[PDB]
């Protein structure tokens, strides 16, 4: 875990629970001291913060680095993708292991570990996607939680005849994951109806990217979410809705939380920063750059409403779902949108987008910003307070943040290998100046200083208090009752 | 269609759109004249209304008379069940044809027609349940609409491995029924989750009727409805949600209608009049009397909220889902609730319940009462204004109604063959005095005067304007843009 | 009354409750016969409808013809304003009597009748605005309902120190009007907060029309509505919200109706057809053409939503609130928006707008279009079925309507005296071909054939069943007595 | 600040943001150390927690100790009232200074400080009620925030002609308090309508306590809250709704917070634990024990819903609004409910009620319990992390809490001087074992060990980040345009 001593002076420290002035001293990957007039060795490297903010580093809970799809890989791998993370203030990522149906979960995990251990600039952890379900899979799941530092698995309600699962299967999986202390994630979209609406759009000769969005209107995201929430509630399992893109999906989550259901919602940079009118762009490749599932909503009031609910705590946390394909790989579907590979950028811009859209607009303050950028992630995934908090003993991943900075986003300038950036030409308030990860300065003066494979896998235990205390209480509370009769 | 000519004087006529004083003259099953100082043949029978209400007769859009179950039948057949209808002011019923899976739809319809033509006291029509789906069934559906006077079909989202249908099947069926001009009805409950929750309740040794309601909490009715509404909307098909029992199911419908979706909701006497606390009764047979699906809600604020949303038009119409089994037949599940046959009473009490609960409580007036008891049914099912309206040319089925009457309901008294009445001991304001059906007096002074088989089948054409005009318009606009590149 | 005989053949008749093919025969201002192969006199004028629609004529429940303003008058008087009504398919109007504070209500009514009796092309009735309250005013109100054919009064929650009323006053007025059987209308906006926000905007140097809309954001409309609905409910008085312009106001109404509150909502042409982005127009006179209160919302999603709720029955009826001022008169406030006179056009375009926006877009069908354009107005204001219905005995005001017609709106072609039309350049689907009022053809081939003063005042009795049956049930239901202790 | 050394071993520490096992060492009123195998002086007093919970001590944000009333005082003074606090796990209180209309605010504050400094067992702070408004009051408000440690003021929308304020006044006050960095609290009830409904109830001869609740139905609480939220929003002032008693009031707050409005809601023990059916009790004194304003709701589903929204964070914090009168003092109104003094118990039972109702029922976990019982109060009122958190440097006020304890509440056993307890006979899961305040053991083995006047006034600075960061951004954001032309 070795790093130099590091001292940051005159900083204003912003955590999710309060802000305060103090100096921070770091050593060997851990924060050692916080306060004034700190007693420290001489000739230690010192950064002068001058009252600029110091925050916990971002935790992007959703990535797809160098993800397999049909004999291709996404263009940003674990190395270049995490450079893109650190560039934008994110010091940890959580990626999705995707086993082939009938493939082994554990084998896919080993493989993903090898890729990541070897290339990642920063710490990371892993979700494991359950792309098919049967008795051996159920055993692997158990083994991954016990021996492998996984506590999060994702099922698919979409992709009919590929990954899609029946209602019985959902019920059995949520029952299992709940019993084991895991988080049940969902890709919540109704694959059965989408299959029909795709065929209808193609019969109507709408093969461009506009047919992607039109074949998955938000009604079908909504339905899938309502069903998942229902089943998660019958099986007393926590649910986590990934990639929240529509208003109606976010209402349902808000509505379910108020009722007392244990549900989390994960908007992504895309839904928080832009909308879906660009599927209608005359430039085909630009339209295809936005193809991701679920799609960006065409209702332009959507980004504002999603930031409003992230501000209110009705959505709890943000990720990016970074999946990047080259113009060339996207072109594979130039005659049929269903063949366009799905994914966009967003890892580098996540924090800037939310600051620009939710903070600078007076929706949330800097403390709730930290929450939705790192601190809630940490609690959900059982990384708290090691991550998502500046306090003594916590890992020394953190960021000096400039609320008055202004940047234009361009593909010209971004770390991503892709030629397109869906936020191209956008002007964002708020950006990082300095990034420390693992106690080491990894960004300063617009220069990255990274090392490939430095990142460690962070094992995530199950049963995080944040998620499971109310579930435990409900389990034990339960005493159903016969009516005793003659 | 022959009847004696009949004259009702001094009546106050209540239709869904207005009330007014006038005399009514009838002959040969049709209303012939309305107004004052009417001219008539000699020796015509006369009834003196004395300013009491005269309304269109009820249309109960949901029955299961003499419905097959395990080689036995529900105890109220088409004859005795329709006696129970007329006794409570209902002059027409719409029953559900239930084909055995893999059985023919048309064959089941022929068979139902024979049963009903032969026994029914009053006019009737038929829904056809689509209990399984394939290329042949699709053809029967088309034939039934074209040649057989059916315009309403019901799918099941519940009864996994018995009638249950996949989402792909739903989509295909709504697409078909929409194209053909039919009403798509749903039993909206999630069969997949109920199967698990049943097993869990039995593993917990809850075999009594309380396990029936606890294995189908209203979350699962709500989900099924949300999914059905969603699919019906993608396929531009009108949807009709049967047997609305919960507040959450009724909110979704209210919510969908506001947004513009073409959706109807059908509460039943049971949900409108009582609640589900009686699954917990220590008397096993009383608890089982309430076993119906979806179940009565245990949340006792439910009947009041359902009447409130029927009042506000967020639910449009009422039926009874009358399905009666003897104590003996219910007992089949005395060791396991999943073997208890599903169904309750309600045909006889429907109009009294709604009057007592929604009118006498000031939620709806007498005109909206007529709407939810007859006039809206007629419009949905394309029977308007022949039924659900007192005007010249309309069929002469109608009722002299006493708003000041008060009755106690009991099994001791009711037309039903069943030994139990789920509304037992309840006191209801509002009841019929006289019922005319087909132009003939079928109830007076507490005596029924019926004839078995007198009822006619009423063919129901598709594309009712009330349901389909907005659907037709939408297809038209349903033209699709593309980007040119 | 007296009019020639008139026969309209081959028409498709559209009422709120059904459509059907039949011929219509008229004589002396009344519809005499409906059906096929009508037996009639020879050489009667005949119109060939050819399967085009025939509807009841529009009833615009909100107008301000030749309304007094600071020694001005609005530019469209009772004659030219009703020509504009008929030109767009409206055959009746209901105008607002506006007494000067401390002036007599009855004196203002006498004056308004003289104006209207003398000039109006078509039948009409009157709302009476209560701009001040005291013991005497309470007496005039009673007298107007008993002898003068008024049943609708409007209070103001805005215009602080002009017409504005306290909560105590609201309570006393609703209590009175409810007891008397009247409809309580409201201008629902919080005058207290607007006064502040106006001053703040002016101190900020925002004197253009954009300051009008910015000084009355919809939050304040919403608050006034909530408070009105609350008080109406405590006092068991029906409430009628005029000029519904915002989404949040319409949600409250929808929300209140679902609960069972007796509340009606009146959107107007402006809110149904266009939005408020035009207060930001750099052309000053165009911006000022939209100045009305409450203002058009700047949220461009608003017209679509208002039509959606009018479609769903959550708003029941439409008017125009026609109040037109010349470019000159508007210019009075060119240095201070609070001096810009308030009002816009809309009487001529109302039916076309709703058709274009709500029917041709598949939101409502032709039958609900009739309801929101005439039939609901008639029931609320106690004119049904004399108006808002094509049936024997009803008045012969009606319209042959072309759903496939398309018109561009411009002031160049409109009947209004004003130089600006807030719907300028808009293309609308649906327009009238032929308009019959009073049994006489008043529009055909693009020519109006009117007569000044031909219009009759229609007296409107209180206690319309549609509004008051639930109210009466709630009074009579109340049994409040002390807990014996 | 001096206290003995104190060590608590084997405890499970529960804060709003996590739980964990560690030992706690305390000295001189401050927590000194947290963790395992702590290095400490020998022979220090040691408490063995054995894995029982240790939480921050409750902060009851709403009390009325020895409050003036009509030359009467409430029966629990600052000493005995704060004994009642500590007995139930509460280690800080925030009371309401109530100046008589037209008195000095500062003079009332001095007086209140003298009463509290002298008698209070535990730390405290003060809200200041603004019972009348003018230019000097505004000045006092400023002074109190700048020199006197006050950051919270309450206004009254009720009590017409006593404390009630106009909309203009509300606007001016919120504008001021927002500019000054204070929290604007409200008693949100419509005093204008209540005045009428009281009379009517009396004019109806309903003089018992049932008339209290029936003269203030929740419709009127709702309206006031809507109006306050609206005004707070126009004036960019944070709003704090006190004594949230009804579901509809809590929905509005939930609804406003979602929109982004800065609003907080304060349920109280009474609304969280019991309901209002007892105003109908035949025992007059029992009924009068519940008389408080706003009243407990008669809708028995209310407590469950208020706990549900406190669980969800839609209501953020709890207080008790403790205001106790003797049976004798309550009897003053035995002939007229409007003369019954308003208030109830609740300080002692607050934490037990919420645990029983919201935690033991699986609605909220132990961490959100700490938040609604202390941590959120601390942030709102700018006491964090000194209070509402167990961490090194924070004040050593805390509690060892037994989630498996079960107590019956009775007046027989409570610290309050009153003869009645509205939670009489109720069984509550969860109770404190040991209470440490100021580093001193003030409850152990059912014995209180208190010292009168030991409590310190805690000055509360304005502009707490939790409340004002979004407000500052909005004000900062408001650079506005004029349309140049
Ligand atoms: Na005239």
Residue numbers in the entry:
A (entry chain B): 12 to 497
B (entry chain A), C (entry chain D), D (entry chain C): 12 to 496
Text from the published report:
The structure of CRMP-4 closely resembles the enzyme DHPase, which also belongs to the amidohydrolase superfamily.
CRMP-4 was crystallized in two different crystal forms, form A belonging to space group P21 and form B belonging to space group P21212. CRMP-4 (form A) was solved from a twinned crystal. The twin fraction was refined to 31%. Residues 12–496 (or 497 in chain B) are resolved in the electron density. The electron density for the 6–8 C-terminal residues is weak (from residue 490 in chains A and C and residue 489 in chains B and D) but is sufficiently well defined to build a good model. Hence, it seems very likely that although full-length protein is present in the crystal the C-terminal tail is dis­ordered and cannot be resolved in the electron density.
